[PDB]
Structure formats: C-alpha cells, structure tokens
Design a protein around this ligand. Structure first.
Ligand SMILES: Nc1ncnc2c1ncn2[C@@H]1O[C@H](COS(=O)(=O)NC(=O)CCCCc2cc3nc4ccc(O)cc4oc-3cc2=O)[C@@H](O)[C@H]1O
Length: 337
C-alpha cells in the first residue's frame, strides 16, 4: 500500500520524537504517513530556539516537566495528556503542508467544530471572547521528503501552560527564533467531553478519505524498543541534555547580585551549551578569586551542577573567602536553571 498509520501508546516526548526521527528517514519515498501521538507534561521547542529564553526551564525542573527540542521549527509549546499530536509525512514533489492542514480541518468539521487556519501555522476557533488558538504546527523538509507535525488543544491544563511558558526575567542577548504568544482555548469548551480517541478517528478518517485508501493502524509499545533503523542511538541523543539544551543558538547572559561583601556582575558568552567566555565586574575588597573564577569558566557547561564544581574547586586555592564564594556559587547556579 501507499499509506502508513502509526499510533503511539507512549507518553515519553523523547520517545515519540525518536520514532518520527526514525520513520522520517526509513520512510519509502512513495509513502504517505500519518503519526498520531500524545505527550505527558512537556514543553516542546523548535530546532532554532533557546530553552532558558523561551520557557520556564527552572519551574519545569522543580515540577519534573520534561523539555524536548523537536527537529522541526516553530515556537515553544506545552504538551499535556489533553494535547493531541499529529504528523503527516510525504515525499516531494507530492508533499504539501496545505493538504495535511485541510485533512485535520475537515476532520474537525466532522466533529462539529468550525475553525480555520491563520497566521503561519495556527488554527483558530471563533469564540465569545473572540478568536482563540486551538492548534499550532511546525514543518521539516529535505531534498525529497516532508513532515507537517502539529498539536490540538483538547483538554490540556491551561494553567500549567501559562506557568511554564512564562520564563524568569533573565538578561539575554540570544540568537534564534522566538515564540509567537497567542490566546488559546480547549476544544472541550466547544464539544464538551471530546477525547483523544474521538479526535484520532476524525483525523484518521479524513486521512483515509482524501487518499481513498485504508490501512490497519500499527501500534507502538512503550515497554519495547521499536524495530527501527538506529533507534537506540536516536532515542539516546534525542534525550540528551546536549541536544535539548546544548543545541541552542549562540547567546549571552548578564547576571547580577548585591552581596553584603560587594556586588557582582557576570557576562556569559555561551555556545553549544558551553561558556566560551566569562567576565566578572565587582566592587569587592577581595576581587582576586572572582577574577580567577572568570578564567576557570573557560569552556564550562552552561549548567548549575558544573558551575558549582568550578566554585568548589576554587575554595581550595582561596580558603579565606569560603563564606563569600559559597554565597556566590549558590546564586550563580540559580540564575542559569
Ligand atoms: N500545545 C500547544 N498548542 C497550541 N498552542 C500552544 C500550545 N502550548 C502553548 N501554546 C500557545 O501558543 C503559542 C504558540 O507559539 S508559536 O506559534 O510560536 N509555536 C507554535 O505554534 C509551535 C507549534 C509546534 C507543534 C509541534 C509540531 C511538531 N512538528 C513535528 C514535525 C516533525 C517531527 O518529526 C516531529 C514534530 O513534532 C512536533 C511537535 C509539536 O509540538 C505559545 O507561545 C502559547 O502561547
């Protein structure tokens, strides 16, 4: 056949992405793939985004909310079990992202909701409060293939959506794509009790309709590594800090705090998750260890656990300022989460 339908029973955002990443390559050029999946408590960012800048990476860590960098573009979005994800995969030149959008759109109309796409990749319903966003999307192409993945806000926690997508005021000069903040709502406010299964059928039946074929859905299990080319390597890298966080565009961070022993200001040049340069500005009466720290951060990870390593390594050479340095390491680690 020409079609392929995949349903994920895994909620690991890293897992499902690794599946697409393995389906996207393994896919025969003549094939047309639909992928239906969900994710439990995650903030998903695009390839060219800065996690610390686009979402509350600190709040997520406190609350065990995973961060995932999708291979496609777009902005930062929050995933929750009331958030349905789809992914249409075709080959060029047959591939068109408007086709997929219409399939989803037709499917929505089959359910009794009347929405239309807008912007670059939104999907907005007309409500009493006006226009509300119930979906977004992002795309990925190569020389011969294509992939249009998107969401659908069925019954996500809108509170946690706002809470994690509202980052701590940080002082950042960052390259990359920034998110386009829109007003959102849940479809359950429109079709009370709409579930993930009900939606999947619509998107599936609309997919089967526009193509005229049918196929039995292939189910993926979480308790088993799917039989895919280099999945084990894919799922491993996709899950790494070096990808989700490291593959952020080059940026800079300005830090400041007024301690009782003086004020300290830090400038961080970060690239591939690594501090390429640290500069200290202080009015402390014993600035020698701080000017020394500035050098010791040459190449250090932009992460709270490695900064504290370098600080507890500094205490050895400068034992007199043990008190002052521990306050410093405590603050420095909390500003980079
Ligand atoms: N879950 C949500 N759904 C819809 N809207 C949401 C959500 N959370 C917060 N929002 C609100 O709207 C804004 C969307 O911002 S945005 O338009 O820049 N950015 C976007 O619209 C990007 C949408 C990305 C959707 C997406 C597309 C994908 N495409 C893929 C394509 C290929 C592949 O292998 C994997 C893929 O995985 C994907 C995962 C995905 O989550 C957020 O800032 C927030 O105010």
């Amino acid at each position: 056949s020409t079609l392929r339908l995949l349903i994920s029973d895994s909620y690991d955002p890293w897992f499902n992405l690794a599946v697409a990443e393995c389906i996207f390559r393994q896919m025969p050029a003549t094939q047309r793939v639909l992928f239906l999946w969900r994710n439990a408590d995650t903030v998903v960012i695009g390839r060219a985004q800065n996690p610390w800048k686009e979402c509350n990476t600190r709040r997520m860590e406190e609350d065990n909310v995973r961060l995932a960098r999708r291979s496609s573009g777009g902005g930062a979005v929050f995933h929750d079990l009331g958030n349905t994800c789809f992914t249409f995969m075709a080959g060029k030149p047959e591939y068109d992202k408007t086709i997929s959008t219409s399939i989803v759109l037709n499917a929505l109309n089959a359910l009794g909701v009347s929405a239309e796409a807008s912007g670059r990749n939104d999907l907005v319903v007309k409500t009493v409060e006006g226009d509300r966003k119930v979906s977004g999307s992002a795309y990925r192409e190569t020389k011969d293939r294509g992939a249009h993945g998107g969401t659908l806000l069925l019954n996500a926690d809108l509170s946690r959506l706002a809470n994690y997508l509202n980052p701590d005021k940080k002082k950042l000069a960052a390259k990359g794509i920034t998110s386009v903040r829109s007003r959102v709502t849940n479809l359950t406010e429109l079709l009370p009790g709409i579930t993930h299964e009900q939606v999947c059928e619509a998107i599936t039946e609309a997919f089967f309709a526009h193509y005229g074929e049918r196929v039995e859905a292939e189910i993926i299990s979480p308790n088993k590594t799917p039989d895919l080319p280099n999945f084990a390597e894919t799922f491993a890298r996709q899950s790494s800090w070096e990808w989700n966080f490291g593959q952020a565009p080059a940026f800079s961070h300005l830090l400041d705090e007024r301690f009782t022993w003086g004020g300290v200001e830090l400038h961080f040049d970060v690239e591939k998750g690594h501090i390429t340069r640290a500069q200290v500005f202080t009015d402390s009466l014993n600035p020698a260890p701080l000017e020394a720290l500035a050098g010791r951060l040459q190449g250090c990870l932009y992460r709270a656990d490695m900064l504290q390593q370098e600080c507890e390594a500094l205490l050895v050479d400068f034992p007199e300022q043990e008190k002052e340095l521990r306050e410093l390491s405590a603050w420095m680690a909390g500003a980079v989460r």
